[PDB]
Amino acid sequence: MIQRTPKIQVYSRHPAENGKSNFLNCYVSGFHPSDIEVDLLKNGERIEKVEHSDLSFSKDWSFYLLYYTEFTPTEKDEYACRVNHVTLSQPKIVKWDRDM
Amino acid sequence: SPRWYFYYL
Amino acid sequence: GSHSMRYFYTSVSRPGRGEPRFISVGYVDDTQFVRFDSDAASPREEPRAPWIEQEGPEYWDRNTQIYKAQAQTDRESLRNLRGYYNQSEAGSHTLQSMYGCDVGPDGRLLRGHDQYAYDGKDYIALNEDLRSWTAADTAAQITQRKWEAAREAEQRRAYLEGECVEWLRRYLENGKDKLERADPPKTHVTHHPISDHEATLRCWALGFYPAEITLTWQRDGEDQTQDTELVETRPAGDRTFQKWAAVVVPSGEEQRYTCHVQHEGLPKPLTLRWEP
Ligand SMILES: [Cl-]
Ligand SMILES: [Cl-]
Ligand SMILES: [Cl-]
């Protein structure tokens, strides 16, 4: 059977201006099967209350989802996104670069 | 709106 | 221009752990407007876009009973494929279904879709003439004859040629320009020195809808691909999209590089040149 590795991406909704309110995003895609564990983390710790889109798929049947949360960027807080899947040895984390 | 006629694969 | 209505069905069988889960999701172009989730308590069809909320109570009740029927239909479809392929209770399998109609500025259908996929691989799909099927292996050929057995693509073409395009038209005129008009990207270029030798230029496109965009980097007005680093188009979260393209350039030669943005919401393609 076909099994596919996810594609993680952390970003903000609007351009990151410190103190002003925004939304953190983690868009995961290109994977198979549907089961996926995706936590957004602040300073290594999981952000609870995290929403997500309704599971959907692309024309190669790859699944895709957008886990997100209201947040506020600071000059020292370090945000990230941890993702697990059966194609993954262990959780994969991607650090939020505000410029990417 | 979604289709309403069903079949089995 | 071109518009499309698409429904995305995912059914995944859970052995021992309850009975399979069903998700529906509905798209006009690439705005999601409805959803259904069998894993819920009081599982309804729910609105996911403001221009669909005006539908009457009978719209929502009717569709809820469709998804409830559809879920049960895929359960036994999951079993039939298990038998075609001689698989086991040891196995979480997946049925993916996608159908929809693509219309031009006419109101005329250009391409209808009705395709399935078992366990990630393509199982069966309906040919563009809407009369034929194309089977991927010997299993799907039994489905292909099952599906000329009750003369089925007749009812499926009739939906694709018929009410599918009208439903698209109804949702287009109800969603007005917030759904028919294309929102153009807000584009700018950022400059990050990476060293003494070098620096990056990043062409940002933000706020655009629909998601189909093209971002190109040129040098001296001619093409340049072997330093481009593109990111996959990502949802902004507010029904708009985002993308960027990047190039590493010798420090002092930045002005020789132009970024080129194609998007339907633009009257003419953009070219951006970072100026010190
Ligand atoms: Cl869930
Ligand atoms: Cl809204
Ligand atoms: Cl907002």
> Could you state, in order of their start, the residue ranges of all structural domains in chain A?
1-100
- Cβ atoms of A52 and A38 closer than 8 Å: yes
What's the structural domain count of chain C? 2
DSSP chain C: --EEEEEEEEEE--SSSSS-EEEEEEEETTEEEEEEETTSSS--EEE-SGGGTTS-HHHHHHHHHHHHHHHHHHHHHHHHHHHHHT--SS---EEEEEEEEEE-TTS-EEEEEEEEEETTEEEEEE-TTSS-EEESSHHHHHHHHHTTTTT-HHHHHHIIIIIHHHHHHHHHHHHHHHHHSPBPPEEEEEEEE-SSSEEEEEEEEEEEBSS-EEEEEEETTEE--TT-EE---EE-SSS-EEEEEEEEEETT-GGGEEEEEEETTSSS-EEE----
CB atoms within 10 A of CB A83: 20
Report whether C257 contacts C245 (CB < 8 A): no
C204 and C175: one domain?
no
Beta carbons within 10 angstroms of residue C2's beta carbon: 13
Pairing of the two strands C45-47 and C31-37: antiparallel
Cα C170 → chain centroid: 20
Are B and A neighbours with ≥3 CB pairs closer than 8 A?
A: no
- In Å, what is the CA distance from A54 to each residue of C48, C62, C214? 10, 21, 26
Report whether the peptide linkage leading into residue C210 is cis, meaning its omega lies within 30 degrees of zero: yes
Radius of gyration, CA atoms only, chain C: 23
C10 has a chain A CB within 8 A of its CB: yes
Query: Among C121, C150, C181, where does a domain finish?
Result: C181
C121–chain A nearest CA distance, Å? 6
Distance of CA A12 to the CA centre of its chain: 11
| C81 and C177 share one domain | yes
Chain C nearest-CA residue for A67: C237
Partner residue opposite B8 with nearest CB, options C80, C99, C159: C80
Does the beta-carbon distance from C94 to A34 stay under 8 Å? yes
Does B6 belong to an annotated binding site?
no
Resolution in angstroms for this experimental structure? 2.9
Run of H or E residues at A9: none
Reported as half-sphere exposure (CB side, CA atoms, 13 A), residue C27 has a value of 21
What HEC string does A26-80 produce? EEEEEEECCCCEEEEEECCEECCCCEECCCEECCCCCEEEEEEEEECCCCCCCEE
C40 inside 8 A of chain A by CB: no
Find the CB nearest A2 among C92, C119, C235: C119
CB A69 within 8 A of CB A80: no
> Do residues C74 and C63 touch, judged by C-beta distance below 8 A?
no
DSSP A90: S
Domain hosting residue C209, numbered range: 182-272
Residue C194 near residue C200 (C-beta atoms within 8 A):
yes
Among C181, C210, C226, residue at a domain's last position = C181
Task: Answer whether C123 touches B (CB < 8 Å).
Answer: yes
Q: Of C181, C199, C228, which residue constitutes the final position of a domain?
A: C181
Nearest by CB to residue B4, choosing from C59, C66, C80, is C66
Angle (CA) C195 C196 C199, round 5°: 50
The label of the residue with tokens 């990502």 reads C234
Taking an 8 Å cut-off on Cβ atoms, the answer to whether B1 and C124 are in contact is no
C22, C146: one domain: yes
Q: What b/e readout covers C182-214, taking b as 16+ CB neighbours within 10 angstroms?
A: bbbbebebeeeeeeeeebbbbbbbbbbbbbebe
Same domain? C161 vs C250: no
**A89: exposed, middle or buried (C-beta count within 10 Å: 0-12, 13-18, 19+)?**
exposed
A23 contacts A70 by C-beta, under 8 angstroms: yes
Is there a single domain that holds both residue C1 and residue C125?
yes
Same domain for C5 and C110: yes
How many residues belong to chain C?
Answer: 276
